[PDB]
Write a protein that binds this DNA or RNA. Structure first.
Ligand SMILES: [Zn+2]
Length: 56
RNA sequence: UAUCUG
């Protein structure tokens, strides 16, 4: 078998403004001062283990 | 009630 806990959802997403994403803001928490790559909320990356080498 | 799109 294979399951973690029910759940049965999935979505990519489209239309979605990038707010006032400042050149010195965070595109993760939405903070200002640190970058997403420097987001203090980021535990460890990369995130999303998807072995799909077909897109380029 | 699962945020790196810059
Ligand atoms: Zn952040």
């Amino acid at each position: 078998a294979t399951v973690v806990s029910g759940q049965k959802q999935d979505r990519q997403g489209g239309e979605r403004r990038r707010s006032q994403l400042d050149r010195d803001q965070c595109a993760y928490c939405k903070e200002k001062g640190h970058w997403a790559k420097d987001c203090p909320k980021k535990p460890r990356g990369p995130r999303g283990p998807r072995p799909q080498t077909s897109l380029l």
